[PDB]
Ligand binder design. Structure first.
Ligand SMILES: Nc1ncnc2c1ncn2[C@@H]1O[C@H](COP(=O)(O)OP(N)(=O)O)[C@@H](O)[C@H]1O
Lengths: 353, 304
């Protein structure tokens, strides 16, 4: 097990291209199994038979470099354990909350998460640190071939892979990128980009996906069109949009430095001073300050602090990890004290060494 | 070369609340020069002539409380005699011919008056009633617990004045207030009793805040510490509030590795005269906010 102890696995702690702004790359493949009804129509037995179908096939069959697969059943996990998986981005909020027969199939390296009995019978999702959409598609395609050797996909040649929700009919592909855009939010150029992004077929979402708000200036950029295009082209289209979004973030940072100057240096250090010394902090402010301190490390204002630890605090300060860190359920008053105590401790360590 | 002399940095009785005590005794053109020339022959003390000081040097002595603003600006022919420990400061040609001033740290009015009259006999003994007794108090709990606007009419009724040291008009910046005032010995004893009454009320108000706010009070004091120790721009008012918070946090024991002198010491060094002196050249207001923050970071960095 021990998927619950670390916030960012060794796989995901690797430095990737454009890791200063692009946190990770995700590629989702949606599939349904023949002779079972869809997740939107199907009885409790078809749910547990699908989980039984996957459990039989993949428990005693490792994945090489990825490692052996462990089957996690939502019914057998505790509410913190579910929230810790959502907060580590392993499973969706839909699976942890609204899917009692849901399951998850995790590789040891935690780069592969296969969601069972969610919106689709199968949600194959690969995760790569930094911007690596092309690499994530080969691994997803390679895994997709590997899985359909042991199960039979419900596919119509004209229709394509059958899906419960109209939004992902056809190839069943959602490719997304998670990006930190503090400068585009501060310059308010994010109110222009978002609607422009929607016009090209891309969708802008929160840190935990649809229904999520943007925590700490971290947004999810994913394609919405799922028809009339190959997987390779839609991944190529998302990449170029992300390349433009990277350039706009990096240029807006120079505009902020040239315009604000010492005031921007004052903004990031004040946020540092709060996080390093506060005794009570809420989820909203902690995200804003951690975003500011991350901005300060990228620009060179803040020294002796790694940006990885800040990537790790965004997760460790979420309700799931905090309770686990505390060891037991926490009340809303208690979480603001624990959250601030956690952040001081991790920063105290950085200064010493 | 120092904002608060080694004499002033010493602990005094009730120095957690009372920053210092002072006593100003009033005693009595060409004759004015004769008076200055008569003192310099008499006097170890050092003499400073206003006509030989430049405007920045004038503003630094007023920020230190060593010389009055009236003498620095409306008396180019004035003079001042300073002690080595800066305890004693004698002003010449202010409102009266001599205005003798004593400064002890904390609440030591009796000791300050004793010395004040003692060298007055020394002056009367070699050459041939306007008493102004004051204390400075840091009262953040009586301000935050909303008692301060009730107490100052009660204090005025007994014949004592209350004036914010650093705040323009009624507003007091940094929660630092000046309390000032029959026989001389009754006047100082009359003030002394009310001051202890204010100390008892301040300390009780601090316990009320701790018992009431708890972790929230600790968060407020440390957030103010985090700002001062790390900010790059800060104005006169935010610095005054945060220094007041940090001092309170040190008094209550939350902040354990910073000496309480920072309040006494930075509220004087953050004044325009010392700020310009800090930078070494005239500063425009936006440059002051940059220099104000840099000075406070160095001071906190010196303890921590
Ligand atoms: N780039 C990315 N990195 C990490 N996680 C990502 C991601 N893009 C999407 N996700 C995760 O994918 C999960 C589902 O996101 P959602 O927007 O519903 O896409 P979906 N259901 O079509 O697969 C979310 O819980 C979100 O945390």
């Amino acid at each position: 097990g021990k998927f619950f102890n670390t916030a960012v696995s060794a796989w995901m702690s690797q430095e990737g291209p454009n890791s200063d702004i692009v946190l990770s790359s995700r590629i989702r493949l949606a599939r349904n199994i023949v002779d079972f009804r869809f997740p939107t129509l199907f009885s409790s037995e078809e749910a547990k038979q699908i989980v039984a179908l996957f459990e039989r096939a993949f428990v005693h069959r490792p994945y090489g470099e990825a490692g052996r697969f462990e089957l996690l059943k939502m019914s057998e996990l505790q509410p913190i354990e579910k929230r810790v998986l959502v907060e580590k981005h392993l499973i969706s909020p839909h699976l942890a909350e609204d899917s009692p027969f849901g399951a998850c199939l995790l590789s040891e390296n935690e780069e592969i998460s296969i969601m069972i009995n969610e919106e689709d019978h199968i949600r194959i999702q690969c995760l790569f640190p930094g911007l690596q959409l092309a690499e994530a598609l080969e691994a997803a395609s390679e895994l997709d071939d590997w899985i359909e050797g042991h199960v039979n996909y419900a596919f119509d040649e004209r229709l394509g892979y059958l899906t419960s929700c109209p939004t992902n009919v056809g190839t069943g592909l959602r490719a997304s990128v998670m990006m930190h855009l503090p400068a585009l939010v501060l310059t308010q150029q994010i109110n222009r980009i978002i609607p422009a992004i929607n016009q090209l077929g891309l969708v802008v979402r929160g840190t935990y996906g649809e229904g999520s708000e943007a925590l700490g200036n971290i947004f999810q950029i994913s394609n919405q069109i799922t028809l009339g295009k190959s997987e390779e082209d839609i991944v190529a289209d998302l990449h170029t949009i992300v390349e433009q979004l990277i350039a706009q973030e990096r240029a807006a940072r120079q505009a902020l430095v040239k315009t604000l100057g010492i005031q921007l240096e004052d903004k990031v250090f004040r946020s540092y001073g709060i996080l390093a010394n506060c005794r009570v902090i809420d989820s909203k402010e902690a995200a804003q300050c951690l975003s500011d301190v991350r901005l300060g490390i990228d620009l060179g204002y803040i020294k002796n602090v790694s940006r990885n630890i800040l990537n790790e605090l965004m997760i460790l300060t979420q309700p799931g990890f905090l309770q686990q860190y505390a060891g037991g359920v926490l009340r809303p008053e208690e979480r603001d004290v624990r959250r601030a105590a956690l952040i001081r401790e991790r920063l105290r360590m950085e200064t010493r060494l």
